[PDB]
Amino acid sequence: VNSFSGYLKLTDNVYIKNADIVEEAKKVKPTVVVNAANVYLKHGGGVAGALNKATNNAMQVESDDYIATNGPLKVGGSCVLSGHNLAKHCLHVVGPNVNKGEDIQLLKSAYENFNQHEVLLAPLLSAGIFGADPIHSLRVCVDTVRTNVYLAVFDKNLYDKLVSSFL
């Protein structure tokens, strides 16, 4: 049993809810929240700017030190950093950004990072401002992630379309 509430069960291991991932993280304090990161860990907008804003910019300060030491992530890659006031850990995952011309086949590699964690609160990778098709991102998630993933979908209209269209 875990703390996640009000999710629709899609598969054995994937759950979905219309929710603000920031507000969900604040309530649950999950072991792992996933950030929709870029390779520079520059948290300006979407999931990254909002989580970063909710940490009072401490996520960005930590991230700048990580990049200064290690250099940029790979598209499809990840790193584990602090969850600050939101979670124990934040798994920063880089899905491909269609609005930068990145290979959508890298979305499966991105979701494979989730399999290193038994339970996660996450957004749909590559969806929203990353430019991919959200129905596609949910399909790749279901077909790639084997650990227990609780997906928060910000847009009520999109949530209803994802549920209604789910195979």
Ligand SMILES: C[C@@](O)(C(=O)O)c1ccccc1
């Ligand atoms: C915040 C967001 O990235 C999400 O994860 O739901 C998002 C996706 C799609 C439309 C609006 C917002």
